[PDB]
Structure 1
Amino acid sequence: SLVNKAAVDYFFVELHLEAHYEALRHFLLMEDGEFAQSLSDLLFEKLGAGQTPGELLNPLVLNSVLSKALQCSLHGDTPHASNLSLALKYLPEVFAPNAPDVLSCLELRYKVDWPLNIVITEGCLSKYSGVFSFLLQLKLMMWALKDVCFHLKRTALLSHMAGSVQFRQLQLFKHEMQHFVKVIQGYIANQILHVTWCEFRARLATVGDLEEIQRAHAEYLHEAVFRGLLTEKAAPVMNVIHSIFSLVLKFRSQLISQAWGPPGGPRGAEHPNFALMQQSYNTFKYYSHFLFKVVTKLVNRGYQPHLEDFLLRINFNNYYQDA
């Protein structure tokens, strides 16, 4: 007991485990919201322009993006943000269009010194890097769709295309997809990023030994993965979510590929990809209804009780139940 107490005190005061968790929150958890926004916008600009990993993930380009995001972040200049490093898992030849996993090659690594690397294991840092990569990919897809939306908005403003039936339908589909994505993101943030983080803090406050600290960190990461839908039980669900994000990105790409035309007729302005955007919207709606039905069947099957929370987040206003 004396050894355990002294070890807890050493880990807290000397190894700054709480400070390490704070650094992970500041840098790896994108607590600097401005840095995350700038990173997402730059990432979606590079991905939508089709830059290759050798062009986009070039150390000069990555370092410039990081410097700009940190300079725009209120927390980007903090010493906790300095522990963040952007590394490449692999170099893609081409950025796949509308791929939700396009930015999964990016990894945020956290360095743990001795003895903290016994508790903050390379496996823990790898799981954190995977979570960071997934959040970065999702932010890239959301940013790409936002950039497509802004392009359509600017084209409508320049061309008075507010009356376009095709443009209005595409905009409504984009808005509904963005609402769904933001609800899902809020759910994931609350469960994995907020609830699991609070659980980790309570557990980090309760860690008694280095093996107990390692167990607490592994539990934190497991809760983050499970609430993050990264578990094998959620692998079919995570794959379906990734497919939905890919379809949303494809719709975004179809909308953004061309600016709105001038309003030429009573139907308003026509988009050259208007038929493709409408087809993408119809496919998104069909896939959303199928996802809702699958999640309902799984919840009623008891296999994935957290998917009941996921279904609630998807169908919070019962919009998908009535459709």
Structure 2
Amino acid sequence: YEALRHFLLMEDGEFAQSLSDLLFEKLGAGQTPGELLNPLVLNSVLSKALQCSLHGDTPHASNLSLALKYLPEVFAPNAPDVLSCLELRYKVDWPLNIVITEGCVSKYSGVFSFLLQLKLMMWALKDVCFHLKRTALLSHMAGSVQFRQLQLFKHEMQHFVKVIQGYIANQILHVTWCEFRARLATVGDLEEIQRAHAEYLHKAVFRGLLTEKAAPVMNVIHSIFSLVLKFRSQLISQAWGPPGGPRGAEHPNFALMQQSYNTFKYYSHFLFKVVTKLVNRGYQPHLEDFLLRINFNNYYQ
């Protein structure tokens, strides 16, 4: 249970970051028409990540497999992989078979999908901060006002995706797994063992918001995430301009970006409305947690 938690549900940070990182580098750079789906590269990146996790190499590291279910015709603009069906597969021995059932690992895979797309978001944003530092304002001789504005626009969305990742992280992960460990200590019979892990996973999904009844918030997350990805890509697409006077023209697409910045802010405000809309109708404690995370300090962040 612990090793599966470490690797599939990504508790060990280093394994998750490295496995996501190599795949992301290839994903954004190219190889889009399923040339990143070659068995050799999939197996190689899996082995590389397992070796470089540094949490340890164990017999438990056996049975880990990287695979795919749906076949992408081609990766979409911005290489989103919003529903890329890359399935981590775990073999289970007959002792670990009455314990683990196929449906349970089908449920396991969902969080890997959603967590991975969160890492994908975090990647590109780390990279645009690293890109503005690639610029470095290396012509420090020229200090650009619009440069100053644009880093603030970046800070907005990186902190938003920081809060969402932190939200789900504090909702599930240590919270539900502590409960599950207590229940695991408590269970004393086959059926008891089955239901403890079953509700461990059902609680994890429910708090994860991937549950069908909580679809609206996840839809707003999709819209926000698509905006952040694409409009972060555009600044990378363009390049700076001659040094003189006020210089917005460095990466002249900034004007279109300001409209995008306003659209992202609109989704943010709408999300603050949505969470309260849903909490008042019914009883969803995770949503109360969410409505304070999204806005902690002022009427709106």
Q: Which has the higher contact order (CA 8 A, sep 6+)?
A: 1
Residue 98 to residue 315, structure 1, CA distance change in 2 (3 Å): farther
Q: Distance in 1 between matches of 2:48 and 2:299?
A: 40
Deviation of the 1:292 alpha carbon = 0.9
Shift of 1:139: 0.7
The 1:206/1:236 distance shift into structure 2, 3 A limit, reads same
Secondary structure, aligned partner of 1:139? helix
Distance of 1:219 and 1:304 partners within structure 2: 17
Is the 1:87–1:108 Cα contact (8 Å) retained in structure 2? Answer: yes
Shift of residue 76 of structure 1?
5.4
Structure (1 or 2) with the greater helix fraction:
1
TM-aligned CA distance change 1:277 to 1:81, over 3 Å: farther
- Once the two structures are superposed, residues 283-309 of structure 1 have per-residue CA deviations (whole angstroms, 9 ceiling, x without a partner) of 111111111111122223335331111
Q: CA deviation at 1:110?
A: 2.4
- How far the C-alpha of 1:262 sits from its partner, in A, is 5.0
Query: How do 1:125-136 residues align onto structure 2 when only pairs under 5 Å count?
Result: 125-136=105-116
Question: Cα offset for 1:100?
Answer: 5.0
Q: Deviations over 1:251-278 (max 9, x none)?
A: 2212222244454432466213212322
Q: 1:237 to 1:99 in 2, by over 3 A?
A: farther
Percent identity between matched residues is 99
- Counterparts in 2 of 1:166 and 1:157: CA distance versus 1, 3 Å: closer
Matched-pair contact (CA < 8 Å) for 2:224–2:267: yes
CA RMSD of aligned residues (A): 2.3
Deviations 1:87-113 (A, max 9, x none): 112121222234754363112222222
Contact 2:66 2:89 in 1 (8 A): yes
Kept after mapping to 2: 8 A contact 1:95/1:102? no
Taking structure 1 as reference, are residues 117 and 143 closer, same or farther at Cα in structure 2, changes over 3 Å only?
same
Uncovered stretches (5+) of structure 2, i.e. residues with no partner: none
Q: CA deviation at 1:48?
A: 2.2
What is aligned with 1:288? 268
Structure 1 gaps of 5+ residues are 1-20
2:54 maps to what in 1?
74
1:218 lines up with 2:218 in the alignment? no
> Residues 301, 217 of structure 1: CA spacing in aligned structure 2 closer, same or farther, 3 A cutoff?
same
- Distance verdict in 2 for CA 1:207–1:285, change over 3 Å: same
Residue-pair matches, total:
301
Match of 1:198 among 178, 203, 220: 178
Question: TM-score scaled to structure 2, two decimals?
Answer: 0.90
CA contact (8 A) 2:46 2:65 kept: no
Classify 1:282/1:247 alpha carbon distance in 2 versus 1 (closer, same or farther; 3 Å): same
CA distance in 2, matches of 1:53, 1:108: 21
Tell whether the 8 Å contact from 1:22 to 1:80 is kept in structure 2 after alignment. no
Provide TM-score, normalisation by structure 1: 0.84
Aligned twin of 1:316: 296
C-alpha displacement at 1:319, in angstroms? 6.2
2:125 alignment partner in structure 1: 145
